[PDB]
Design a protein around this ligand. Structure first.
Ligand SMILES: [K+]
Ligand SMILES: [K+]
Ligand SMILES: [Mg+2]
Ligand SMILES: [Mg+2]
Length: 135
RNA sequence: ACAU
DNA sequence: CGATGT
């Protein structure tokens, strides 16, 4: 603790894993939805969590905001730190879209800078992250 | 085991 | 119960 309330919180929602993947970002304090990604027909939970963080980085940079990002995903936080999404999802025609988005997110990380702190939301202490889908 |  | 990840 404590929660940094001046922050952006992201989370993934899916129908199956692998399955339909979406994500959203919210104001941690107010719950206002700041962005939502159109559902992607096939992806994994961790790919979605990764895309959500990267989108948050791009969203905050475009707005000249120094707020941190919260995610509850140990995996996605590490993938962003590494600039490399180490997903096991097969590459085929069905997964082409999510893989294109992941490749492009990595490419963005490798061509841009940011100071945005990427923080672990401590679900065991604080309850569900504010961007949670409730599924 | 931990995080989803 | 299954799956994605470190
Ligand atoms: K949920
Ligand atoms: K496991
Ligand atoms: Mg999550
Ligand atoms: Mg959730």
């Amino acid at each position: 603790e404590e929660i940094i309330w001046e922050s952006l919180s992201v989370d993934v929602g899916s129908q199956g894993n692998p399955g339909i993947v979406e994500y959203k970002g919210v104001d941690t304090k107010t719950g206002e939805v700041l962005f939502e990604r159109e559902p992607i027909p096939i992806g994994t939970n961790n790919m979605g969590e990764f895309l959500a963080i990267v989108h948050g980085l791009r969203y905050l940079k475009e707005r000249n905001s120094r707020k941190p990002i919260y995610s509850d995903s140990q995996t996605a936080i590490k993938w962003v730190k590494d600039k490399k999404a180490k997903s096991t999802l097969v590459r085929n025609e069905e997964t082409a879209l999510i893989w294109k988005l992941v490749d492009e997110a990595e490419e963005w990380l490798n061509t841009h800078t940011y100071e945005t702190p990427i923080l672990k939301w401590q679900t065991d202490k604080w309850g569900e992250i504010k961007a949670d889908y409730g599924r």
